[PDB]
Amino acid sequence: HEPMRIAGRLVDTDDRVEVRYPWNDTVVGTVPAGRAEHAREAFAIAAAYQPKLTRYERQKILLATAEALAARKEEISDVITLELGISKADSLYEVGRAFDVFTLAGQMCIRDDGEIFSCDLTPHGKARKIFTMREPLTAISAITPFNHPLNMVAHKVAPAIATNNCVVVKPTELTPMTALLLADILYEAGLPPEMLSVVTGWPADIGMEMITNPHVDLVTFTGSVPVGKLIAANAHYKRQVLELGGNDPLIILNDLSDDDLARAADLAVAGATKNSGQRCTAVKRILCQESVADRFVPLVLERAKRLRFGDPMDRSTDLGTVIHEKAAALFEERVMRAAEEGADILYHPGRSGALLPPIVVDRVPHQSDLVLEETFGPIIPIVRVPDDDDATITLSNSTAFGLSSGVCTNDYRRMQKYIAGLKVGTVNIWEVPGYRIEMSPFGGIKDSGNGYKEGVIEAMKSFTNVKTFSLPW
Amino acid sequence: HEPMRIAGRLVDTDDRVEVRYPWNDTVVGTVPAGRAEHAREAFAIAAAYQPKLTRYERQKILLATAEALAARKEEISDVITLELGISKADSLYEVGRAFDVFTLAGQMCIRDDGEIFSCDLTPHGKARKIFTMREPLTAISAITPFNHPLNMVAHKVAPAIATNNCVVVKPTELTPMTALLLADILYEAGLPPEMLSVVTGWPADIGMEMITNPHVDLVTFTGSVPVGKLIAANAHYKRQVLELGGNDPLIILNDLSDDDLARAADLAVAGATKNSGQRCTAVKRILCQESVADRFVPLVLERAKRLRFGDPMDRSTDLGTVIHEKAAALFEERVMRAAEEGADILYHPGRSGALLPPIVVDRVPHQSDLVLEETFGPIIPIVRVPDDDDATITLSNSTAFGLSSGVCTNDYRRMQKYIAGLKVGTVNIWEVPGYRIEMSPFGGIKDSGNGYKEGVIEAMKSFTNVKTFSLPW
Numbered sequence A, B: 001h002e003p004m005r006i007a008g009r010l011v012d013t014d015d016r017v018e019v020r021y022p023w024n025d026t027v028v029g030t031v032p033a034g035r036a037e038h039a040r041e042a043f044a045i046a047a048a049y050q051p052k053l054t055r056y057e058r059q060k061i062l063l064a065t066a067e068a069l070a071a072r073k074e075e076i077s078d079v080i081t082l083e084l085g086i087s088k089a090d091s092l093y094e095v096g097r098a099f100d101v102f103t104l105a106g107q108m109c110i111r112d113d114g115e116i117f118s119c120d121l122t123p124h125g126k127a128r129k130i131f132t133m134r135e136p137l138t139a140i141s142a143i144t145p146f147n148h149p150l151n152m153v154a155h156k157v158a159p160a161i162a163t164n165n166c167v168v169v170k171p172t173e174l175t176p177m178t179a180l181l182l183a184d185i186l187y188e189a190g191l192p193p194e195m196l197s198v199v200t201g202w203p204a205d206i207g208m209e210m211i212t213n214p215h216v217d218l219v220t221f222t223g224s225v226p227v228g229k230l231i232a233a234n235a236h237y238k239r240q241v242l243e244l245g246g247n248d249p250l251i252i253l254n255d256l257s258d259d260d261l262a263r264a265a266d267l268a269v270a271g272a273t274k275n276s277g278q279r280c281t282a283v284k285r286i287l288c289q290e291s292v293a294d295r296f297v298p299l300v301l302e303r304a305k306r307l308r309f310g311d312p313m314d315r316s317t318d319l320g321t322v323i324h325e326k327a328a329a330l331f332e333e334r335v336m337r338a339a340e341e342g343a344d345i346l347y348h349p350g351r352s353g354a355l356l357p358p359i360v361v362d363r364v365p366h367q368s369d370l371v372l373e374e375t376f377g378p379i380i381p382i383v384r385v386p387d388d389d390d391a392t393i394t395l396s397n398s399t400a401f402g403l404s405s406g407v408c409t410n411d412y413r414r415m416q417k418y419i420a421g422l423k424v425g426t427v428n429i430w431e432v433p434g435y436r437i438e439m440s441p442f443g444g445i446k447d448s449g450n451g452y453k454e455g456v457i458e459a460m461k462s463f464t465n466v467k468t469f470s471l472p473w
């Protein structure tokens, strides 16, 4: 049982939202069914407080938070696993990412990206210099999804702190406890409590306030397309940073040797199953050129079969559950539907509630739901594509999504052709689409995002207003 | 009588929009009453065309456009003056600015702001490099206001061309002809005609299509708050760059000598009346600290009285008309209302239709409509403020706007206090709020803009998507 954290105060309601462990569907916790008025109060506190932390003080808070994450990683990952159902291996990894987010944000605090312009440049010129600086917003609204209960909150909160913003976070009702815990760690690390509130509740009660509150200068949201579009419609005249799904390919080109196909098979399996496949940039389509598919697929099958799936709290489990039974069932349905359309299921030890095995399916039709829609689970689906790069690129670009991608090849000419031709935010050569550092520009186009970049550096710019001033010179 | 320019083709309709000369209210021109289908066609052409211009070719087109603007400046300013009513002096000046915009955009074509990241940064590190590059959008929608019929179109089109975008412009029905003329110059300068259309019509018919067309990746708008908010509400899930009005101060501090007050008076009069005061960053509130107001005001009066206002086509006219008689009447009303509330009218030779003289009004109440609302005419209104910087800053920040500002003082300590304390996009020391170069970051906060920067350099970044790619290293 965990109250909301509203500027460092514990705030409860009578009604509760129950949090269930997807492994066995038991209640592992409860948080308040907060209402608009709670969000409203959090935003008023955020608006009224004017942070005065020096860059040194910000760095010290952010680095202390990193140290606390590392020190408490076992405890934090337990909370993640118990709420989300991913393996301890995956949740421990997630704490490591949050540790990087806070560390990198702390280190970026010393960096001033101000610019200077000389004005004697044209016939309209003057003896004068223009200088730029950045200032924080009134308040920032952060709405986070279930797939990274810790790291998604870190990515929105760390850059806010580093820029002297005040943020209010509404985590998903499915995995709210991790966020509440992160808030406690931040207060303990010395954050002025007005800079952070974490409120909880049903979208129907508190969701709209997060979007429309008059103090909110910026809404940063990560989650699904439908919820994303709704937000974009309802948050008028607010800056919006919306990251919606992906449907990202790992592309296997026909120049690879058998040793390379094996390394690619490693990437395909890891990319498709890490975090139970619950990543906007998970491998959701393995596009394998026809002439190597016969050697490639077996290598993939063999690796999938090595994966231990089961009890998420067992430290030797690789693959835990997906978010719930209904999602798992939907994913299995899409598999079955694809098999009826010609697909060849090579490995499917059977689903158990929310626990989905790393199902390997070959010869998936590219227009079947399994790969055309976003399938947010640990399916390993190989689509066989022509030994033609133009046709492969056209196919890769044929979905509503455009986030990341991975391409395995040794031919530079083809590398650069894919880099130029894939309609995505990121193209990784010889890595999964999921690969990034926590501070590189991140974001998609098309239905994957509204077109603004994220990651620690771009988030920090995004959470500020640039002010210019000029002086006689 | 001018047709629309749709990808280089002249396109007419039966119904006409009449363009009147605000000096004598005669019809000087006509353009088509375009409809949604015309905008629709322009956008389809824009989306389907993929520009392949090298940076060299873009530069050559932009610099050739600048040369044409210079060579035809008399012809172009005639068209501006006949449409808007500003003096030839102001319209010639506007051509010079458009000349700078195209020149600077042309020169920025050689600049590649890509970055490189090393990935071996954390325990999660890899021997890998990430590189960034920019790519154009599908189509850009540009909507422009009447106050700079040439330069506002330049600022939205030049950066599009520089980045290989395709843009469709809908100028205001009040001053569309200048835009149509700029399109001919661009075609003549070698622009692939698919990269530019200029459509015209009533907002009721064609305006919504410019906001909601499915090919539009970004809407860039400059105009009024109400129209701006309407666009933000209707353009969901499109990037939006909205610049709305300002209500900007020139602030006179009490450390100034009498010689300095005279220089400040020069800025006050120029800033309040240039372009008939029709600038988002016009001086609309002269905040003079009380202890110097008795010496400052007379210097303002004396300078105002030197301005020649009248026939805009007379080359010795300083100040031409405002956009129309209704606007002129509204502004005069606000002056009268302010005098009933205690203001002191020091100079008012009388309005004549759309021709407003540079009225000087002292002791204006800060909450009177004249200065609280945005008054888009050549009024010179002095608000007497306390000899107290905190009170002066609070007063300056008390409106719904926050765009630019000017401060006249020699005390560094006070300079930096204003620079830090004014809630605006720009603070100019010893210049009018309107001062900028065509490539410095430009944009307001609060009701002045939705929070994204403009100017040639920021517009170019804005009109692209950043793609990243990583390579094994």
Ligand SMILES: *C(=O)[C@H](O)COP(=O)(O)O
Pocket: A147, A148, A151, A222, A243, A278, A279, A280, A281, A434, A436
């Ligand atoms: C998607 O998962 C989310 O927006 C961030 O991507 P990760 O790299 O998976 O965090």
Ligand SMILES: *C(=O)[C@H](O)COP(=O)(O)O
Pocket: B147, B148, B151, B222, B243, B278, B279, B280, B281, B434, B436
């Ligand atoms: C306001 O006029 C418009 O946004 C641009 O401002 P100028 O400085 O007048 O060009």
